Design a binder for this molecule. Structure first.
Ligand SMILES: CCCC[C@H](NC(=O)[C@H](C)NC(=O)[C@H](CCC(=O)O)NC(=O)[C@H](Cc1ccccc1)NC[C@H](CC(C)C)NC(=O)[C@@H](NC(=O)[C@@H](N)CCCNC(N)=[NH2+])C(C)C)C(N)=O
Ligand SMILES: [Cl-]
Ligand SMILES: [Cl-]
Ligand SMILES: [Cl-]
Ligand code: NA
Lengths: 99, 99
Protein backbone atom coordinates (compact mmCIF):
# COMPACT_ATOMS: atom_id res chain seq x y z
CA UNK A 1 0.00 0.00 0.00
CA UNK A 2 0.83 3.72 -0.11
CA UNK A 3 0.46 5.36 3.32
CA UNK A 4 0.24 9.10 3.69
CA UNK A 5 1.26 10.75 6.93
CA UNK A 6 -1.60 13.11 7.80
CA UNK A 7 -2.44 10.60 10.55
CA UNK A 8 -0.16 8.30 12.49
CA UNK A 9 0.82 5.32 10.29
CA UNK A 10 -0.84 2.71 12.46
CA UNK A 11 -1.17 -0.88 11.28
CA UNK A 12 -2.37 -4.14 12.76
CA UNK A 13 0.34 -6.62 13.74
CA UNK A 14 0.05 -10.23 14.84
CA UNK A 15 2.51 -11.60 17.34
CA UNK A 16 2.02 -14.60 19.64
CA UNK A 17 -1.37 -15.18 18.01
CA UNK A 18 -2.46 -11.79 19.28
CA UNK A 19 -3.50 -8.79 17.21
CA UNK A 20 -2.04 -5.44 18.28
CA UNK A 21 -1.73 -1.95 16.76
CA UNK A 22 1.74 -0.63 15.95
CA UNK A 23 3.27 2.44 14.38
CA UNK A 24 5.45 2.19 11.27
CA UNK A 25 8.47 4.16 12.42
CA UNK A 26 11.26 5.08 10.05
CA UNK A 27 13.02 6.90 12.87
CA UNK A 28 13.41 3.66 14.86
CA UNK A 29 16.31 1.34 14.30
CA UNK A 30 14.51 -1.43 16.12
CA UNK A 31 11.04 -2.80 16.83
CA UNK A 32 9.78 -2.20 20.35
CA UNK A 33 6.53 -3.54 21.80
CA UNK A 34 4.72 -3.19 25.12
CA UNK A 35 5.05 -5.79 27.79
CA UNK A 36 3.93 -9.20 26.63
CA UNK A 37 5.18 -12.78 26.86
CA UNK A 38 7.33 -14.21 24.09
CA UNK A 39 8.90 -17.59 23.82
CA UNK A 40 12.53 -18.37 24.28
CA UNK A 41 15.38 -16.66 26.01
CA UNK A 42 16.04 -12.97 26.02
CA UNK A 43 19.19 -10.82 26.19
CA UNK A 44 19.57 -7.30 27.55
CA UNK A 45 19.59 -4.14 25.47
CA UNK A 46 19.61 -0.46 26.16
CA UNK A 47 17.83 1.79 23.71
CA UNK A 48 17.57 5.50 23.43
CA UNK A 49 14.82 7.86 22.45
CA UNK A 50 13.87 11.44 22.88
CA UNK A 51 13.63 11.29 26.66
CA UNK A 52 16.69 9.20 27.43
CA UNK A 53 17.58 5.49 27.67
CA UNK A 54 15.56 2.48 28.80
CA UNK A 55 16.30 -1.21 29.34
CA UNK A 56 14.42 -3.69 27.20
CA UNK A 57 14.30 -7.45 26.66
CA UNK A 58 15.65 -8.59 23.32
CA UNK A 59 13.98 -11.61 21.72
CA UNK A 60 15.51 -12.84 18.49
CA UNK A 61 13.83 -14.69 15.63
CA UNK A 62 10.26 -13.88 16.52
CA UNK A 63 7.51 -14.44 13.95
CA UNK A 64 5.44 -11.30 13.45
CA UNK A 65 2.91 -10.29 10.82
CA UNK A 66 2.84 -6.62 9.91
CA UNK A 67 -0.06 -5.31 7.87
CA UNK A 68 -0.44 -8.78 6.47
CA UNK A 69 3.26 -9.20 5.62
CA UNK A 70 5.30 -11.93 7.39
CA UNK A 71 8.51 -10.99 9.15
CA UNK A 72 10.83 -13.00 11.41
CA UNK A 73 13.28 -11.03 13.49
CA UNK A 74 14.27 -9.26 16.64
CA UNK A 75 11.59 -7.79 18.87
CA UNK A 76 12.41 -5.65 21.90
CA UNK A 77 9.95 -5.67 24.79
CA UNK A 78 9.72 -2.88 27.33
CA UNK A 79 8.17 0.37 28.56
CA UNK A 80 7.47 2.10 25.28
CA UNK A 81 4.79 4.71 24.79
CA UNK A 82 3.66 2.88 21.64
CA UNK A 83 4.30 -0.37 19.77
CA UNK A 84 6.77 0.58 17.10
CA UNK A 85 7.88 -1.24 13.97
CA UNK A 86 11.45 -0.14 13.26
CA UNK A 87 13.72 -0.46 10.30
CA UNK A 88 14.81 -4.02 11.13
CA UNK A 89 11.34 -5.25 10.18
CA UNK A 90 10.32 -2.48 7.79
CA UNK A 91 13.10 -3.73 5.52
CA UNK A 92 11.71 -7.27 5.72
CA UNK A 93 8.32 -6.12 4.43
CA UNK A 94 9.92 -4.09 1.65
CA UNK A 95 8.99 -0.66 2.93
CA UNK A 96 10.40 2.52 1.46
CA UNK A 97 9.96 6.21 2.02
CA UNK A 98 9.07 8.18 -1.09
CA UNK A 99 8.61 11.89 -1.94
CA UNK B 1 13.51 10.12 -4.20
CA UNK B 2 12.80 6.66 -2.96
CA UNK B 3 14.54 6.01 0.31
CA UNK B 4 15.28 2.49 1.40
CA UNK B 5 15.51 1.76 5.08
CA UNK B 6 18.61 -0.37 5.33
CA UNK B 7 20.18 2.67 6.91
CA UNK B 8 18.76 5.62 8.82
CA UNK B 9 16.87 8.00 6.48
CA UNK B 10 19.06 11.05 6.96
CA UNK B 11 18.72 14.16 4.88
CA UNK B 12 20.16 17.63 4.77
CA UNK B 13 17.88 20.40 5.88
CA UNK B 14 18.19 24.20 5.96
CA UNK B 15 16.56 25.98 8.88
CA UNK B 16 17.23 29.44 10.21
CA UNK B 17 19.94 29.77 7.55
CA UNK B 18 21.75 26.74 8.98
CA UNK B 19 22.48 23.44 7.31
CA UNK B 20 21.74 20.45 9.50
CA UNK B 21 21.35 16.70 9.15
CA UNK B 22 17.98 15.29 10.22
CA UNK B 23 16.12 11.99 10.40
CA UNK B 24 12.89 11.46 8.49
CA UNK B 25 10.72 9.98 11.22
CA UNK B 26 7.26 8.69 10.42
CA UNK B 27 6.86 7.84 14.11
CA UNK B 28 7.11 11.48 15.17
CA UNK B 29 4.05 13.69 15.19
CA UNK B 30 6.23 16.79 15.44
CA UNK B 31 9.53 18.15 14.10
CA UNK B 32 12.21 18.58 16.78
CA UNK B 33 15.55 20.29 16.29
CA UNK B 34 18.56 20.59 18.58
CA UNK B 35 19.11 23.89 20.38
CA UNK B 36 19.20 26.89 18.06
CA UNK B 37 17.65 30.32 17.78
CA UNK B 38 14.65 30.90 15.62
CA UNK B 39 12.76 34.16 14.96
CA UNK B 40 9.43 35.15 16.51
CA UNK B 41 7.47 34.11 19.53
CA UNK B 42 7.52 30.66 21.11
CA UNK B 43 5.74 28.77 23.87
CA UNK B 44 6.89 25.94 26.12
CA UNK B 45 5.84 22.39 25.38
CA UNK B 46 6.59 18.90 26.70
CA UNK B 47 7.12 16.07 24.22
CA UNK B 48 7.56 12.44 24.97
CA UNK B 49 8.93 9.26 23.52
CA UNK B 50 11.08 6.38 24.57
CA UNK B 51 12.74 7.36 27.79
CA UNK B 52 10.18 9.99 28.81
CA UNK B 53 9.68 13.65 28.17
CA UNK B 54 11.74 16.71 27.37
CA UNK B 55 10.84 20.40 27.49
CA UNK B 56 11.03 22.25 24.17
CA UNK B 57 10.23 25.65 22.68
CA UNK B 58 7.46 25.68 20.08
CA UNK B 59 7.84 28.07 17.18
CA UNK B 60 5.08 28.36 14.61
CA UNK B 61 5.20 29.17 10.88
CA UNK B 62 8.87 28.27 10.41
CA UNK B 63 10.15 27.51 6.92
CA UNK B 64 12.52 24.59 6.48
CA UNK B 65 14.13 23.21 3.37
CA UNK B 66 14.14 19.40 3.44
CA UNK B 67 16.32 17.66 0.89
CA UNK B 68 15.54 20.59 -1.42
CA UNK B 69 11.85 20.78 -0.70
CA UNK B 70 10.51 23.82 1.13
CA UNK B 71 7.88 23.33 3.79
CA UNK B 72 6.38 25.53 6.49
CA UNK B 73 5.06 24.57 9.91
CA UNK B 74 5.72 24.25 13.62
CA UNK B 75 9.20 23.42 14.77
CA UNK B 76 10.10 22.40 18.30
CA UNK B 77 13.55 23.24 19.67
CA UNK B 78 15.24 21.58 22.64
CA UNK B 79 17.58 18.91 23.96
CA UNK B 80 16.74 16.19 21.46
CA UNK B 81 19.39 13.52 20.78
CA UNK B 82 18.70 13.85 17.05
CA UNK B 83 17.19 16.34 14.63
CA UNK B 84 13.86 14.85 13.59
CA UNK B 85 11.54 15.70 10.72
CA UNK B 86 8.12 14.57 11.83
CA UNK B 87 4.80 14.07 10.09
CA UNK B 88 3.77 17.72 10.30
CA UNK B 89 6.45 18.56 7.70
CA UNK B 90 6.70 15.15 5.97
CA UNK B 91 3.15 15.64 4.75
CA UNK B 92 4.05 18.94 3.12
CA UNK B 93 6.75 17.43 0.95
CA UNK B 94 4.39 14.60 -0.03
CA UNK B 95 6.23 11.85 1.75
CA UNK B 96 4.64 8.39 1.78
CA UNK B 97 5.46 4.95 3.09
CA UNK B 98 5.14 2.27 0.48
CA UNK B 99 5.30 -1.50 0.61
C1 LIG C 1 23.71 2.21 16.08
C2 LIG C 1 22.70 1.88 17.17
C3 LIG C 1 23.19 2.30 18.55
C4 LIG C 1 22.10 2.47 19.59
C5 LIG C 1 20.95 1.45 19.45
N1 LIG C 1 19.80 2.17 18.98
C6 LIG C 1 18.97 3.03 19.51
O1 LIG C 1 18.76 3.21 20.71
C7 LIG C 1 18.23 3.84 18.43
C8 LIG C 1 19.17 4.90 17.91
N2 LIG C 1 17.00 4.43 18.94
C9 LIG C 1 16.04 4.76 18.06
O2 LIG C 1 16.17 4.65 16.84
C10 LIG C 1 14.70 5.16 18.65
C11 LIG C 1 13.74 3.97 18.77
C12 LIG C 1 14.15 2.82 19.67
C13 LIG C 1 15.05 1.80 18.99
O3 LIG C 1 15.06 1.80 17.74
O4 LIG C 1 15.78 1.09 19.68
N3 LIG C 1 14.08 6.18 17.80
C14 LIG C 1 13.30 7.11 18.31
O5 LIG C 1 13.00 7.14 19.51
C15 LIG C 1 12.78 8.20 17.40
C16 LIG C 1 13.63 9.45 17.55
C17 LIG C 1 15.09 9.19 17.88
C18 LIG C 1 15.93 8.58 16.97
C19 LIG C 1 17.26 8.32 17.26
C20 LIG C 1 17.80 8.69 18.48
C21 LIG C 1 16.96 9.30 19.40
C22 LIG C 1 15.64 9.55 19.09
N4 LIG C 1 11.39 8.52 17.72
C23 LIG C 1 10.39 7.61 17.71
C24 LIG C 1 9.28 7.94 18.71
C25 LIG C 1 8.05 7.03 18.70
C26 LIG C 1 7.10 7.16 19.88
C27 LIG C 1 5.87 6.28 19.74
C28 LIG C 1 7.79 6.81 21.19
N5 LIG C 1 8.77 9.29 18.49
C29 LIG C 1 9.06 10.29 19.32
O6 LIG C 1 9.78 10.21 20.30
C30 LIG C 1 8.36 11.59 18.97
N6 LIG C 1 7.22 11.73 19.86
C31 LIG C 1 5.98 11.94 19.42
O7 LIG C 1 5.64 12.12 18.25
C32 LIG C 1 4.92 11.93 20.51
N7 LIG C 1 4.04 13.09 20.51
C33 LIG C 1 4.06 10.65 20.43
C34 LIG C 1 4.34 9.52 21.38
C35 LIG C 1 4.56 9.79 22.85
N8 LIG C 1 3.52 9.48 23.77
C36 LIG C 1 2.81 10.22 24.60
N9 LIG C 1 2.99 11.53 24.70
N10 LIG C 1 1.91 9.57 25.34
C37 LIG C 1 9.32 12.78 19.06
C38 LIG C 1 10.55 12.50 18.21
C39 LIG C 1 8.67 14.08 18.60
C40 LIG C 1 20.79 0.73 20.77
N11 LIG C 1 20.69 1.61 21.93
O8 LIG C 1 20.78 -0.51 20.77
CL1 LIG D 1 15.92 -8.36 12.98
CL1 LIG E 1 2.65 22.26 11.69
CL1 LIG F 1 -1.39 13.79 0.13
NA1 NA G 1 6.41 32.11 14.47
Amino acid sequence: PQITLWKRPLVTIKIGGQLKEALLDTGADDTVIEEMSLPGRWKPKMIGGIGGFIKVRQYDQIIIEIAGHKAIGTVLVGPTPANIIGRNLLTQIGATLNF
